[PDB]
Symmetry: C2
Subunit: 197 residues, 2 copies
C-alpha cells in the first residue's frame, strides 16, 4: 500500500490524563488509520497513485484531498505533542514567540481563543507566515496552511469533536487547556528551522 500510517513517537497512554489512552486508540487506530486505508483505495487507477502524501495533498480536491490532508494533519498533530513536553517554550521558538506575540502567555491566550472559537470540524495552527512572522491560523475540516499557501505549519491542534469527546464531552475548553501540558516545543523548533531555511 503506497501510503503507510506513520507510527506515534510514544505509547498510546503517553498523553494521559490530558488525552486518554482510549482517545489515542480511537483517534489514531480508527480515524487516522481509516484515512490512510481510504486514501489508498481512492488513489488506485489515478495519477495520484505514485505521488507522495504531500504531493497528493497539494494537488488533489474532493475525497482524495480530504483523506490525504487528514493523514498529514494527524501526523503533524501527533508529532506536535509528547510525554515529558508542555510547559514554556524553549530553544529558537521561545524567542520567536516573544518577538511575534510579546510573550508566551499572549500566544497561549490567543491560540486557546481561536481553538475554542472554531465552529464545526477543524484545526488551529501556529504557522510561519509568508512574511517570516509567527501567526495563529485556523482551518476547516481537512484544510491546512500548505494547501492554502498561507505559511509553514509549526504546530497544530485538532478540534474535530472526536479529538476530545471521550474525555471532555462538549467541554472543548478543558481539552484545549489540558493540551498545553502536551505541546512539543522540540517539534516546533524542528519546523521553525526548516521554515526559516
Amino acid at each position: 500500500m503506497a501510503i503507510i500510517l506513520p507510527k506515534l513517537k510514544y505509547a498510546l497512554n503517553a498523553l494521559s490524563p490530558h488525552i486518554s489512552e482510549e482517545t489515542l486508540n480511537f483517534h489514531y487506530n480508527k480515524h487516522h488509520a481509516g484515512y490512510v486505508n481510504k486514501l489508498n483505495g481512492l488513489i488506485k487507477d489515478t495519477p495520484f497513485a505514485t505521488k507522495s502524501l504531500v504531493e497528493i495533498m497539494k494537488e488533489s480536491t474532493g475525497a482524495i484531498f480530504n483523506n490525504a490532508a487528514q493523514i498529514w494533519n494527524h501526523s503533524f498533530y501527533w508529532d506536535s505533542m509528547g510525554p515529558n513536553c508542555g510547559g514554556e517554550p524553549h530553544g529558537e521558538i521561545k524567542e520567536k514567540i516573544q518577538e511575534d506575540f510579546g510573550s508566551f502567555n499572549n500566544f497561549k491566550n490567543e491560540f486557546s481563543n481561536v481553538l475554542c472559537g472554531h465552529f464545526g470540524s477543524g484545526w488551529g495552527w501556529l504557522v510561519l507566515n509568508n512574511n517570516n512572522k509567527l501567526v495563529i491560523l485556523q482551518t476547516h475540516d481537512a484544510g491546512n496552511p500548505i494547501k492554502d499557501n498561507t505559511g509553514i505549519p509549526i504546530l497544530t491542534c485538532d478540534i474535530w469533536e472526536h479529538a476530545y469527546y471521550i474525555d471532555y464531552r462538549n467541554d472543548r475548553p478543558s481539552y484545549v487547556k489540558a493540551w498545553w501540558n502536551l505541546v512539543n516545543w522540540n517539534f516546533a523548533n524542528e519546523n521553525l528551522k526548516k521554515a526559516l531555511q
Copy 2:
C-alpha cells in the same frame, strides 16, 4: 428572547438507539448553548426583534451558525420519537414509493448520504418545488431553508457529538439505529403542509 423549544419526549425516550446521556449533552449543552450564544450575539442588533427563521435567513457567520443550529436541532428532535421508526405509514409511505421506488431504496440511499458526509453536517429529506421528495446534505449549520432547496420533511444530525458517546467512530451503526427512531408522523405533518 429566543427560547429553546421543549423536546416532545423524555431524554431516555430514544434509548438504546440514542442514549439518555447523549440526549442530555446534545440537548442541554449543545442545543441550549446555541440558544444562549445567539441571544448574546443579537442583543443590540436589528436581529433582536426578528424570528428565528428571519435571523437564519438574513444572517451570516456566528449569528447564522447559532440560529440555524437552533432550528436544525429542533427539527432533528421532532424527526424522532419513542414508538416510531420501522416502515413508513400514511402519506409519506406512498410519496416515498412514488419518488424513491420503495422504502428500501430510500433507506439505503439516505443511509449512504448520512454515512458519506465529511466533517460536521446534516442529511435531509425535503420536498422540492416540483413536489418531489429529494435527499439533500448540508455542511455545518447549513439547511434547505437557508439554501432555498426545498421544504424540510425530516433531518438527521451527523455531527460527531450526535453519536460519539454511543458509537464512537462507528457513524454507520448510529445511522442504522436512527431508523428505529424516525418519526413518520412528523414527516406526514410536514408533507401535508409542504404539498
